[PDB]
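User: I'm writing a short report section on ligand binding and want a predicted complex to refer to. Could you take this sequence and 2-acetamido-2-deoxy-beta-D-glucopyranose and write out the structure as C-alpha cells? A short remark afterwards would be nice.
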Amino acid sequence: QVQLQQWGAGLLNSSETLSLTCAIYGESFTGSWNDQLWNWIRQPPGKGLEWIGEIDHSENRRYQPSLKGRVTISVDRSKNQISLKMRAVSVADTAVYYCVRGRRATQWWAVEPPANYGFDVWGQGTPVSVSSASTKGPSVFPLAPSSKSTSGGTAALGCLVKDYFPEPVTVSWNSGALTSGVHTFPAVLQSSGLYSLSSVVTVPSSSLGTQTYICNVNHKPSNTKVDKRVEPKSC
Amino acid sequence: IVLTQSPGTLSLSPGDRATLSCRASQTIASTYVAWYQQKPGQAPRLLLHQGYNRATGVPDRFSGSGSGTAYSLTISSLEPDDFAVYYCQHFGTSPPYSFGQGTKVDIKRTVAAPSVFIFPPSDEQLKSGTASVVCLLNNFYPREAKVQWKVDNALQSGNSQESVTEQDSKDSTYSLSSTLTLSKADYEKHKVYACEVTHQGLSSPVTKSFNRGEC
Ligand SMILES: *[C@@H]1O[C@H](CO)[C@@H](O)[C@H](O)[C@H]1NC(C)=O
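Assistant: Sure. The C-alpha cells for the complex follow:
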C-alpha cells in the first residue's frame, strides 16, 4: 500500500521560498528494482497538469526548464521524505502541488513492473496560494435585482464575496432555507492575490416584495460571519 | 514534444462510445503514452500506461489504441461514473514530461439557452473606491458560451474574470459568472456597461446593459 502524504506552508508572500515535504509510505526510495521516480506535479486553478521536477532512485534530479533554476528537489533518505523548494514565487506559481510516484524499469534482468512509465500513485496535494495579503475577511456586497436582471418572470439576485484570503468561504441563503435555483461559483484569484466569488439565485420577480433574501457568508480563516440583506433596487 | 487532445469537450450519455484523441508533435513509441482520469476535487487517476496496458483496478471498458502520432482512449460504453476530465501524457525515458490540455466528457442533454442578467456595482462597494460589474448566465447547455464586456465604445480585455459551476445534478446545465472590475475613478468616466452573450440556444447574441447614474 504505497502512500504519499504532503505537508508544508501553502500561504506565501511574493518572492518567498516555497517549502513542501512529501513522506513516502509503503515503498522505499529506490524500490525493489531501482525503478522509482518521485515527481512533483502542479495544477494551477482551472488549468491542467504541469510537471515541475523529479528525483529518481539514483538521487538524480531533473527540473522543468521553464522554471529556470528556481526549483530544488532533495530527499531525506533517513526519513524517506522528499522536499520541494521553489524560490522567488510569483502569483503564477499559485497551484495545487502533487507528490507523485512514477516508475521506469532500469534492470534488464527484471520483469516489467506494474504501471511502468506511469504515474500510478498521487498524493492528496497541498494547495499553494501566493499573495501579499494577510488573513482578511470578505466584504459582502449586494447583487441587487432590478429591471436589468429579469428574464421573463424571473429575477436574479446574489452577493459578491470579494477580497478575502485565503480560501474558502461558505455561502447560504436564508440560513439554508433557500436552496432551489442557487448557484455559488468557484472563487477566482484576483491580481492582488485576494479571492472573490459570487453566489446568486433566481426567484420570481413578484417575490421581491414579499420575501426577504439574505446571503449567509462564513470565512472561517478570519472568523468573519456576514449576513447581507439583498434588496431590490427601485428606480 | 507537444500533446494536443481533441475534442475539447465530449457530450455523451451512458452506453455511448467515447473516443478521445491524443496527437503528438513528433512520433512517439507506445511505451511512452499514459492516460489519466480526474474528477473535481480529486487527484488524477492513472488509467492506461505504456499506451494500452490498463492500470490496476481500471475496468474493461477503458482501452487504449493507436501508434506513431495518433493515440486513443476508448471507453466501450460510458458508465455513469466516467464523466470527468481525461489527460494524455508523454512518459518518456527521461524528463521533461508533458501533458495534453485535456478532454472533458460531460452529460449530453437538450440545448438550453442561458438567462442573462447584469448587476451594477453596489453603493457599498463604490464607497470604497472599486466598481465590480457582474454578468450572470444561468442554466445553459452546452458549456460553450461567449461573454464579451463592452464599456461605451470599447470592448473590454484584461479586467474581467469568469467562473463556471459544475454540470448540475438536477438538470445537467451550466452557469457562468463574469465580473468586470474597475477602479471607481475609471468606472465613473463611462456610462453604458454591457454584457454580450453568445450561445447555441440564443437566436442572436443577447445584450444586457445598464447606464451608470441613470435608471
Ligand atoms: C505578507 O506579508 C505581510 C507583512 O509581513 C503579512 O502580514 C502577511 O500575512 C503576508 N501574507 C502571507 C500570505 O503570508
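A remark for your report: Residues A 11-13, 131-134 surround 2-acetamido-2-deoxy-beta-D-glucopyranose (CB under 6 Å). Chain B touches chain A through 56 residues (CB under 8 Å).
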